[PDB]
Structures are given as C-alpha cells and as structure tokens.
C-alpha cells in the first residue's frame, strides 16, 4: 500500500495534477489494471496524453477518458510494455488503435536490406546475450588490459548476461591461449575459436585471410567486421564492440526488445546544409555496426545472406567500392586496379609507401595529380617535375619542392610529415568501405535509400516518414543497453586507432 501510494503519485504527476476532472475517481477506476510500467505511457509527450487533453475540452470527459484509458491500457499499452515495446512504438500502436482520437498518416513503405520495414513488433531480440570479438595482433597477448576490464565491467553491470567471445587461437602462442581459456572460463564467457567454425558462408575464407595476412595488408577489425554476417556465429542476441559500456538504467525488465526488421543496427541521422533547388535541408540516416541486434527468426538468416553476398562481391572487386575514396586518386591504385591486385596487396602497398621515407617513392605512389595536391604545387610546378622525374634523385626532387613554396634533412622531414598526415584518410576506407559500416550501409540500401528531405512534425514522434520509420523500428542502439558515441545522434545538424597499421 506504499506500492499503491507510489502508483497513485505517478498517475497524478503523469496526468499533470489536472482538476478539469477528478483524478481520484479516475485512478480508483483504473487501478485494478494499472501498473507503474503503464503510467510512463500516459505522460506529457505521449499520444495517450495528447488525446486526454482533447477529451478534457469536451463534454462527459470523466467518463470518456475513463473508457479510453481502460481500453488503451488493457488492449495496447500493457501488452506493449510486457512485450518490450518502446514509448515510440506504444505511441504508434495507440494512434493506430484510436483513429477517432488521433489523426495520423499511413506507415510509409520503407525497404531495409531487401525487407519492407514492419510495424507489427514481430521480430524479437534478446538483450541478455552478447557477443564480442578480439583478434590479437600480438601472439604474446591474448587481450590487452583495457579489453579485459571492459568484459569484467559488463558482467557486473549486466549482471546475469551471457557473454560470448570470438577469438583466433592460431593468432596466439600456447601460453597466450592457455591464458585466454583461463580468463573466459573464469569470467563464465563462452569462447568461440574462429579457426574451427562450421559454415558455408563465403565470408569465412575472407576472415581467415584477413587474419592470415596480418603484416601483409590484413586487418583484425576487418575480420571482426565480417564475422558479424555469418549465421552460424550470430543468430540471436547482440553483437557489441568489446569496449562498449552498458547503461544499466536502460536494461529492460524482460531482457527483450522488438523491431520491424530482423537485424537492427546503431543508427542516427545528419541534417545537411540547405541544398538546391529549394534551399532545403536533407536528413540522411547514418548507421554503425558497433551494435547489431539479431532476431530469433528465420528472416534473420535471409537478411544476413543479402549482406554477406554484397560483402563477398566487394572483396572480389574492391575497386568499385573504393572509387570515391582519396586513395582512388592515386597512381598506385590505378595500377593495382589494372593488375587486379587484391585488398591485402592494396593495403600493404599503401602502408609500404608511407613507411618508405622516400620522396621519390611517394611521388611514384601518389602520381603527379595527387602529389600536386598534397604538396600544394602550382600546375606549372608539377608539370616541370613530372617531365623530369626520371632524371631526379631524392635531393633533386626536394630542391624543387623547396623553390616551389637551409636544413635539407629537416626539410625532408617536414615534407614527409605533410604527406603522412594523409595516411589515415587513404587507409580507413580500405576497411570501412570493404567490411565496415560503409559497405554495410550500401548492402542495406545505400545513401540514396536513406536520405530524404527533412520534415519536422508536431507533438509525439510517429513513424510516418522513412527516417522516422528507421528511428522507431530499426535502431538497436536506442533500444539496447549499450552505450556508443561512434556516430551522430538522431537528427544532428551537420554543423554541430587500434586498427591503423603504424
Ligand atoms: O587489434 C584489434 C583491434 C580491433 N579488433 C576488433 O575491431 C573492433 C573495433 O575496434 P575499435 O578499436 O573499436 O575501432 P573503431 O574504429 O572504434 O571501430 C569501428 O570501426 C571498425 C572497423 O570497421 C568496426 O569493426 C567497429 O564495429 C566500429 O565501431 C574491436 O571491437 C575488435 O572486435 C580486434 O579484434 N583486434
Ligand atoms: Mg571503438
């Protein structure tokens, strides 16, 4: 009866302590069927709240509001709270259930990974089953302290979750592997050795190659990226970057959320500057793969395979995926493409060029156009160099850079450092557009498909435009208990690395 008093207090707050009706008798008439969980969906900002405010202005409001709430609670809100529905999702379900009280548009047709997004709430996701991945580039170290501590932290902050960890035993020496096994079974972590997994995925040999090629153009984050689209590895729960903190205040009582597609990702959006021809801003949905939720459903494998086939296509021919990256503007890239060098040779060659400490090698790598841009040379200046490059030694090239603008050793370092600060921009797309969030965004439908002219609405958010549909039904970040600031939040105005090889 403190329990009753608490419930009563929440109800009176939720409904704004109004006296245009008698909240005492309303409460008393709903309390047989009123839980704390339900009251959240009666608060200002809710669809249910908005209807109450309109009913208040009318005759017979006491009775009309009671019968509205009795049904809305029993038929819509309570079942939705139990099911793991969000406030957004319950708001839409209330609007749909009461068109006489809430005017609203149809669910727009939005496709996402070849699936039409639904509002049925039918795909279900476990928040208590979580899988992370650590592939070590140092055979002596199973996992650094930071990653170990993150895992310990999660077990405590989540306090009965099931943690699975994918790793590679062949990347570790025998003592490191002994340490890994001790760590996992001590932490009650389920270990999965990537080295010996049974699957028909075309992504499996690609993972093995990324890892086998460490030091020769392979990348451990790219391997981790790819594992996430293999059905034998991910068929329920969440993928989460090993380093993501849990926000315990976000853990839902039933350890279950729902979605309108069978695979949800971290999402947000960016509101562009005005564009032609109406000088109007566009909202472009952005996504990230640091948090992925997988439905306990057959449709999960189907959607997963669409993505996997796309990833396979990219690895087979990465030059198309990379066509608008800074690296695409280089002589080296154009040669690699003619030669059909693969992704590993492409990454290793970039790495080699920036390890070279040779202005001449860098010239050959960049080609005159990019070299001109990196060194801010006039057209006539690059023309002279390029006409005579076959005659130059290193000092020759440096003397020309200097005049185009007394320690030749320090000057060399200065110019080398100027080039080096482009390395990151050249390299990152060789993962992000190949296995990472860029490739995945494209596999799920691409820029076009996820951009629309920015519309801002009145009152409670409903899934009535494409980005709203994605925000309401497809975003694993806001529904799950994991924290990430890796991408923009939803509706962010455009105006507001462990895996980079040294
Ligand atoms: O030595 C390493 C370094 C990274 N990783 C894996 O790669 C992931 C991402 O590493 P992180 O240092 O977090 O890189 P970020 O740039 O923050 O990660 C972003 O970019 C990566 C590359 O596409 C994706 O794997 C991530 O999900 C995405 O959040 C890690 O969680 C691990 O799974 C390893 O396994 N071994
Ligand atoms: Mg990270």
What would the DSSP string read from start to end of 284-327?
EEEEEEEEEEE-SSHHHHHHHHHHHHHHHHHHH-HHHHTTTSGG
Collapsed DSSP state (helix, strand, coil) of residue 147: helix
Q: Is 304 left (phi over 0), alpha (psi -120 to 50) or beta?
A: alpha
Mutation probe of ligand 1 site: the residue of 133, 137, 224 with most atoms within 8 A of C-beta: 224
Ligand nearest to the CA of 150: 1
For residues 247 and 312, is the Cβ–Cβ distance under 8 A? no
| Residue located nearest, by CA, to atom 23 of ligand 1 | 436
Residue 236 vs residues 83, 172, 245, 311, 358: alpha-carbon distances, Å: 17, 28, 20, 21, 50
Q: Where are the domains of the chain?
A: 1-107, 108-316+433-502, 317-432
- What CA–CA distance (Å, rounded) separates 243 from 23? 47
How many beta carbons lie within 10 A of that of residue 372, not counting itself? 18
Region of 217 on the Ramachandran plot (φ > 0 left; ψ -120 to 50 alpha; else beta): left
Technique used? X-ray
Give the chain's radius of gyration (CA, Å).
Answer: 28
- Rounded Cα–Cα distance for residues 386 and 368 (Å): 7
Task: Determine the distance separating the centroid of ligand 2 and the alpha carbon of 250, expressed in angstroms.
Answer: 20
CA distance linking residue 383 with residue 360, whole number of Å: 15
Please give the resolution of this entry in Å, rounded to 1 decimal: 1.9
Tokens of 32: 């047989």
By the 8 A CB rule, do 501 and 351 touch?
Answer: yes
**Ligand 1 centroid, distance to 221 Cα (angstroms):** 5
C-alpha angle 310-314-318 in degrees, rounded to nearest 5: 165
Q: How many CB atoms lie within 10 A of CB 341?
A: 19
358 annotated as ligand-binding: no
| Ligand 1 nearest-atom number relative to CA 134 | 35
State whether the Cα torsion 353-356-358-359 is positive or negative: positive
Half-sphere exposure of 421 (CA within 13 A, CB side): 7
DSSP state of 189: P
List, in order, residues 6 or more apart from 344 with CB less than 8 Å away: 209, 210, 213, 216, 217, 218
Is the CB of residue 84 less than 8 Å from the CB of residue 258? yes
Report how far ligand 2's centroid is from the alpha carbon of 241 (Å): 7
Q: Could you confirm whether domain 317-432 is CATH 1.20.120.990?
A: yes
> What tokens appear for 233 in the block?
């590895």
DSSP string of 220-283, one letter each residue: HHHHHHHHTT-TTT-SSEEEE-TTPPB-GGG--TTSEEEESSSEEEEEEEEEPPPBTTTTB-EE
Residue 325 sits at the vertex; the CA angle it makes with 322 and 330, to the nearest 5 degrees, is: 95
Contact present, 385 and 393 (Cβ < 8 Å): no
Residue 458, sorted as left (phi over 0), alpha (psi -120 to 50) or beta, turns out to be beta
Rounded to 5 degrees, φ, ψ at 108 are -70, 160
CA distances from 352 to 452, 481, 501 (A): 41, 41, 10
Give the mutation target among 133, 438, 499, 500 for probing the ligand 1 site: most ligand atoms within 8 A of CB: 499
Q: Find out whether 178 is annotated in a ligand binding site.
A: no
What dihedral do alpha carbons 319, 320, 322, 325 form, nearest 10°?
A: 120
Q: How far apart are CA 138 and CA 172, in angstroms?
A: 7
Nearest CA to ligand 1 atom 28: 290
Q: Is 499 annotated as a binding residue?
A: yes
Q: CA–CA separation, 432 vs 286, rounded Å?
A: 13
- What is the greatest pairwise CA distance in the chain? 96
Token duo for residue 148:
């170990």
Query: Ligand 1 atom closest to Cα of 499?
Result: 3
Convert 349-405 into a string of H (helix), E (strand) and C (coil): HHHHHHHCCCHHHHHHHHCHHHHHHHCCCCHHHHHHHHHHHHHCCHHHHHHHHHHCC
135 is in an annotated binding site: yes
At the top level of CATH, the class of 1-107 is mainly alpha
Residue 243, marked binder: yes
Query: To the nearest 5 percent, what fractions of the chain are helix, strand and coil?
Result: 50, 15, 35
């Amino acid at each position: 009866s403190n329990e009753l008093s608490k419930l009563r207090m929440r109800f009176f707050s939720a409904l704004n302590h109004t006296s245009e009706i008698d909240l005492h008798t309303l409460f008393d008439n709903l309390k047989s069927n009123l839980t704390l969980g339900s009251i959240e969906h009666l608060q200002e900002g809710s669809v249910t709240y908005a209807i109450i405010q309109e009913l208040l202005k009318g005759a017979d409001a006491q009775k009309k509001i009671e019968s509205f709430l009795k049904g809305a609670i029993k038929n819509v809100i309570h079942p939705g709270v139990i099911k793991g529905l969000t406030p957004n999702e319950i708001n839409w379900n209330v609007a749909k259930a009461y068109p006489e009280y809430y005017e609203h548009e149809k669910l727009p047709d939005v496709t996402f990974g070849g699936f039409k997004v639904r509002d049925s709430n039918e795909f279900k996701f476990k928040t208590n089953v979580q899988t992370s991945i650590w592939f070590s580039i140092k055979p002596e170290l199973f996992m650094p302290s930071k990653q170990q501590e993150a895992l310990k932290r999660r077990r405590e902050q989540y306090p009965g979750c099931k943690i699975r960890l994918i790793y590679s035993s062949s990347l570790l020496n025998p003592e490191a592997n002994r340490q890994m096994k001790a760590f996992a079974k001590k932490q009650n972590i389920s270990l999965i050795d990537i080295d010996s997994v049974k699957t028909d995925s075309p992504l499996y040999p690609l993972i093995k190659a990324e890892l086998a090629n460490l030091g020769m153009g392979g990348n451990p984050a790219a391997a981790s990226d790819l594992c996430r689209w293999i059905p034998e590895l991910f068929n329920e729960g969440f993928y989460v970057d090993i380093d993501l903190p849990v926000d315990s205040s976000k853990i839902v009582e039933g350890h279950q959320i729902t979605g309108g597609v069978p695979i949800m990702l971290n999402m947000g959006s960016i509101i562009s500057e005005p564009i032609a021809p109406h000088h109007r801003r566009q909202e472009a949905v952005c996504m990230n793969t640091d948090i992925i939720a997988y439905a306990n459903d057959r449709e999960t494998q189907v959607m997963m395979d669409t993505v996997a086939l796309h990833l396979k296509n990219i690895y087979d021919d990465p030059y198309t995926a990379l066509k608008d990256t800074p690296l695409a503007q280089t002589a080296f890239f154009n040669r690699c493409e003619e030669e059909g060098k693969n992704i590993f040779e492409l990454r290793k060659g970039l790495q080699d060029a920036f390890r070279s400490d040779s202005l001449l090698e860098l010239y050959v790598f960049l080609g005159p156009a990019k070299f001109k841009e990196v060194f801010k040379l006039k057209e006539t200046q690059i023309k002279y160099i390029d006409d005579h490059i076959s005659e130059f030694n290193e000092h020759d090239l440096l003397l020309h850079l200097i005049s185009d603008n007394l320690d030749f050793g320090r000057a060399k370092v200065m110019y080398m450092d100027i080039a080096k600060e482009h390395y990151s921009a050249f390299y990152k797309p060789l993962v992000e557009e190949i296995s990472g969030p860029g490739a995945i965004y494209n596999a799920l439908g691409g820029a076009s498909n996820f951009t629309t002219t920015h519309r801002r609405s009145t009152g409670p958010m409903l899934p009535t435009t494409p980005p709203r549909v994605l925000q309401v039904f497809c975003d694993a970040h806001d529904k799950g208990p994991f924290v990430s600031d890796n991408i923009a939040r939803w509706q962010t105005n455009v105006r507001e690395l462990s895996w980079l090889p040294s």
